[PDB]
């Protein structure tokens, strides 16, 4: 699709089998979800933004169905206020900004 | 321009006469800069992200030269780790996401 930016750019995804809404976020390097359960080993990490770093777990497998594509991506899991789709995932689906 | 997302989407702007680099950030509701000085009255605020709330001043005049356009927009000033151009400014220049 092509969208304007008058509303927050949410999309519906399925991540590790769970349905979620997440913000298409060109300012996020890294996709992050809260409140999902994923199997297997993880590696610990932190992400930094406006007003603080957060603690996350990293998963490297994890399926992500987004905008009619299925990619395999890195997903960070931790208590973000909204779920975001970052550039790691958006580049896999060929997303572009026009301005 | 049309850009892909393989790198952080920085643009060069002139905000209140000062040259800055800022991230085109579709996950940001409003534009924020650090280390700019702007004239006139302001109003207090906080924004929230990964990690919690950055404290800011809001200015309502403030000229912003971006991508060959000159907007007048709202600008928040506070200690963000990277300057961001949010949807408030991006909508005024007609920016779109393609995915
Ligand atoms: C989280 C999102 C819903 C809100 N934020 C915008 C983001 O685009 C932010 C913009 C941002 C970029 C760079 C530093 C701080 C914030 N990026 C961000 O938090 O990304 C994190 C996840 O991937 C990593 O890549 C950048 C990172 F931060 F490190 C990590 S924000 O910065 O908190 C923000 C909130 C409100 C306004 N008005 C403006 C900005
Ligand atoms: Cl909205
Ligand atoms: Cl929780
Ligand atoms: Cl980069
Ligand atoms: Cl590039
Ligand atoms: Na990904
Ligand atoms: Y939760
Ligand atoms: Y500073």
UniProtKB/Swiss-Prot annotation, chains A, B:
Residues 20-89 form the Peptidase A2 domain. The active site is at residue 25. Homodimer, whose active site consists of two apposed aspartic acid residues. This is Protease. Residues 1-5, 49-55, 88-99 are annotated as: Dimerization of protease. Coiled coil: none annotated. Aspartyl protease that mediates proteolytic cleavages of Gag and Gag-Pol polyproteins during or shortly after the release of the virion from the plasma membrane. Cleavages take place as an ordered, step-wise cascade to yield mature proteins. This process is called maturation. Displays maximal activity during the budding process just prior to particle release from the cell. Also cleaves Nef and Vif, probably concomitantly with viral structural proteins on maturation of virus particles. Hydrolyzes host EIF4GI and PABP1 in order to shut off the capped cellular mRNA translation.
